[PDB]
Design a protein around this ligand. Structure first.
Ligand code: CL
Ligand code: ZN
Length: 313
């Protein structure tokens, strides 16, 4: 009977001393077992494993609490999905493009590249320590844990088509957006005026128009009575807003916005590019960089900087 000492963990901070029998698999001893994303469930302990840290599933009460405190989930499959993703994302390249961490194209990750690029241009603090820790490493160029977490939080596998608006929506649920406030006003000529106050995630996202200006002036929407009503922004308190719409030809003017997502293709299949406004317009497509004075393209998402807005109307 040969034994080695290893450490189990769910958070890669708190370690649990285990003595493993080298005659049985990790699976027979701990259940599903991963070594930096690699599934070692059906492998037997090698000598070179002595003193290494394995991720295991939260199989007792201490690990359930460690896992919850670090990731803010009790989804039974979360760590499996994280590990499975990490195994791929640690193989991706993360070049610095114009001082932002991007991702070299692989495994249909264009929506993640534009998400990662967007997150480095907006004021956002994550609540789950997993996201805080991984984001800090992502800003510095080691984005593999962050990208695998986005996949695990969003319940996406590597290779699956993602939507940038849906992805941002999940990440925003795990961000401190409690100070964010939006007041809308809906004028129908029959039904009269109706104010609505939105907080948190619903205060920074809108689907229907790409234009922050048009949202301030009013957009037409159908009222329950059947008339077109005008919905306009009365008050905005957020460090950013995100305007989203189905992809349409739209002209981005330098200095009028922070960054945007371009989508070419259809519902089922397509590609994202990222446009950022700096000294001029840069298009980032994974590792690729071009610039222009003006940009026209099928835009789906535009991010604007904000502090406080109050309507004059
Ligand atoms: Cl742990
Ligand atoms: Zn009405």
């Amino acid at each position: 009977v040969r034994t080695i000492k290893v450490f189990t963990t769910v958070d890669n901070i708190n370690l649990h001393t285990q003595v493993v029998d080298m005659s049985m698999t990790y699976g027979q001893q701990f259940g599903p077992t991963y070594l930096d994303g690699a599934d070692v469930t059906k492998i037997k302990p090698h000598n070179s494993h002595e003193g290494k840290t394995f991720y295991v599933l939260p199989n007792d009460d201490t690990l359930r609490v460690e896992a919850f405190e670090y990731y803010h989930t009790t989804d039974p499959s979360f760590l499996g999905r994280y590990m499975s993703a990490l195994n791929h994302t640690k193989k991706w390249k993360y070049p610095q493009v114009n001082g932002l961490t991007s991702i070299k194209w692989a495994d249909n990750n264009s929506y993640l590249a534009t998400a990662l690029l967007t997150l480095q241009q907006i004021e956002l603090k994550f609540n789950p320590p997993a996201l805080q820790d991984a984001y800090y490493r992502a800003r510095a160029g080691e984005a593999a844990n962050f990208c695998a977490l986005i996949l695990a939080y969003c319940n996406k596998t590597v290779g699956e088509l993602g939507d940038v608006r849906e992805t941002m929506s999940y990440l925003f649920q795990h961000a401190n957006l409690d100070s964010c406030k939006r007041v809308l006003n809906v004028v129908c000529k029959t039904c009269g005026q109706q104010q609505t106050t939105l907080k948190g995630v619903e205060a920074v996202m809108y689907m229907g128009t790409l234009s922050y200006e048009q949202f301030k002036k009013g957009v037409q929407i159908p009222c329950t009575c059947g008339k077109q009503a005008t919905k306009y922004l009365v008050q905005q308190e957020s460090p950013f807003v995100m305007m989203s719409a189905p992809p349409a030809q739209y002209e981005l003017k330098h200095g009028t916005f922070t960054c945007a997502s371009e989508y070419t293709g259809n519902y089922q299949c397509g590609h994202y590019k990222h446009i950022t406004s700096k000294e001029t317009l840069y298009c980032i497509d994974g590792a690729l960089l071009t610039k222009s004075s003006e940009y026209k393209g099928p835009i789906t998402d535009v991010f604007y900087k904000e502090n406080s807005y109050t309507t004059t109307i």
